[model samples]
Target: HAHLKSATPAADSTVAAPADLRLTFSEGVEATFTKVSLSKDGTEVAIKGLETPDADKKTLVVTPAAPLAAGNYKVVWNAVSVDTHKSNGEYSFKVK
Candidate 1:
């Protein structure tokens, strides 16, 4: 597994709406095979943009096309690490 190294708007934390979502991992990841999903109150939230900005492919940056109203959110992600293994996880955060 490509262990998740860190995340912005960290898990179970509260903060204002972030301009984008960031997830960093211990190993590189496949840009084409990567995906991020958002949900709130059992309804799926839309994610309009996704990218890996670092040359190492260890960081994934996700952008929402529109403003997200204040609420608790769940983020789910799946990616194939450079090692060619699949990794997936989910976390929750609050928007103030």
Candidate 2:
């Protein structure tokens, strides 16, 4: 099963505008079936890609299409493990 291990710009944290959102999970994730979304003020932000480039496939990297404005952002993820187990999570952070 997949579980949220940690993330870049971790939950409830604030940081300068980052180009990527790296979501770390406890199990090998299947990028083909996973869903990751970033939003601000209830509107979804456009993403450049959802990629798992590491051999372990335990982290999903989301790149936003444009630089983020100063505000709060929310991430919603639905991950599917290599073994087909599903897990979902939500977290928020601020762009300073």
Candidate 3:
């Protein structure tokens, strides 16, 4: 949806991996329902993590201490509003 956006090395596989990942929703995401994860080949990586706040809670930013390798990775998320309405989606990307 237009309200959602995802950040990674590349929307598709790429050579230069991103040092950090982020997703921004047009509206403030539900603090309670928001979730984030990175996976390779369906196996959970030890360096898995979530998004954090900056400025206001409207934006979500993430930093992974361990860098990602060249391969397909997925960002899974669930976000809900204070009213309990929710949105969920997954994006596959790569680190080259």
Q: Rate the local accuracy (lDDT) of all candidates.
A: 0.86, 0.91, 0.63
The candidates, ranked best first by TM-score, are 2, 1, 3
User: Which structure is stronger by lDDT: 1 or 3?
Assistant: 1
Give the candidate number with the greatest TM-score.
2
- Window of ten residues with lowest summed lDDT in model 2: 41-50
Clashing pairs in 3: 14-96, 15-96
lDDT per residue (tens digit) for residues 1-96 in model 1: 677888998999999988888899999887688888898766788888878888998888888878887899999999889899998999999998
How close is each model in CA RMSD to the real structure? Answer: 1.1, 0.8, 3.0
Residue 74 C-alpha lDDT in model 2: 93
Model 1 clash pairs are: none
Model 3 CA deviation exceeding 4 Å by range: 13-15, 30-32, 47-51, 82-84
Writing each residue's lDDT as its tens digit, candidate 2 over 1-96 gives 999999998899989988789999999998889998889978899988888999999989998998888898999999999889989989999988
Q: Which residues of candidate 1, in runs, are more than 4 Å off?
A: none
The residue-by-residue lDDT of candidate 3 on 42-93, one tens digit each, is: 8665534455465545566656658767777887767764455677777777
